[PDB]
Amino acid sequence: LSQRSKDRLVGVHPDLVKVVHRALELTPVDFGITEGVRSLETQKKYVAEGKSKTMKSRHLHGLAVDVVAYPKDKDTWNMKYYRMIADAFKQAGRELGVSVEWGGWVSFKDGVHFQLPHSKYPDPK
């Protein structure tokens, strides 16, 4: 049973929180949560620093988490370890009846990234 540290799911949408907790239960590789909610200021920097594309991002409204694998051999950035987690997120999505999206040959940045879909969980107007 993988136990979670002090992780800021606080303000993350409860549908996604519950998917998180369950994916952990059923994960081959232990993981943590790097970012949950991202401030509009932090977001602004990221656009200008040429990181993120639009001024829009799931992270603003608690509709995204990014994870980091803790895979024993310490091999933190191994593509596969993120797919083992995607699989665990998808399945917790199948239970719980939540449609979860994975970033997904998958770049690190895409592979750490989970969100609740736009249709079901839309941005404020």
Numbering used by the authors: 1 to 125
Quote the original article:
Endolysins are bacteriophage lytic enzymes that can hydrolyze cell wall peptidoglycan, causing lysis and bacterial cell death. LysECD7 reveals a wide spectrum of activity against Gram-negative bacterial species, but it is not stable enough in PBS and human blood sera. Thus, this molecule was modified with the N-terminal α-helix of SMAP cationic peptide to enhance the antimicrobial properties, suggesting SMAP-mediated permeabilizing activity of the fusion.
The active center of the enzyme contains three amino acids coordinating Zn2+ ion (H62, D69 and H117) and two additional charged acids (R41 and D114) bound to the water molecule for Zn2+ coordination, forming a charged groove important for PG binding. LysECD7 also contains the SxHxxGxAxD motif (60–69 aa) in the cleft region conserved for LAS-type enzymes. For endolysins acting against Gram-negative bacteria, the presence of an additional membrane-translocating domain is predicted, allowing the enzymes to cross the outer membrane of bacteria and reach the peptidoglycan substrate. There is no obvious characteristic sequence on the ether C- or N-terminus of LysECD7, but a region enriched in charged and polar amino acids is detected in the α2 helix around 44–61 aa of the chain, predicted to be intrinsically-disorder region (IDR) with strong polyampholytic properties (FCR = 0.44) and low overall hydrophobicity (2.76), also containing a putative antimicrobial peptide. It forms a protrusion covering the substrate binding pocket of the enzyme and is enriched in lysine residues along the inner surface. Such elements can lack a compact ordered structure, e.g., under conditions of neutral pH in vitro, while under certain conditions the structure is stabilized and the domain acquires functionality, either the IDR can fold upon binding to interaction partners such as PG and other bacterial cell membrane structures. Comparison of the solved structures of native and hybrid molecules revealed only a slight difference in two α-helices involving α2 and α5, which together with the β1-β3 sheet form peptidoglycan-binding pocket, resulting in a more closed cleft architecture of LysECD7-SMAP. We could not resolve the SMAP peptide structure, due to its high mobility, thus the LysECD7-SMAP model was used to perform molecular dynamics simulations. During the simulation the ‘core’ LysECD7 part remains stable (residues 1–131), while the structure of SMAP fragment is remarkably variable (residues 132–148), proposing the free interaction with bacterial membranes.
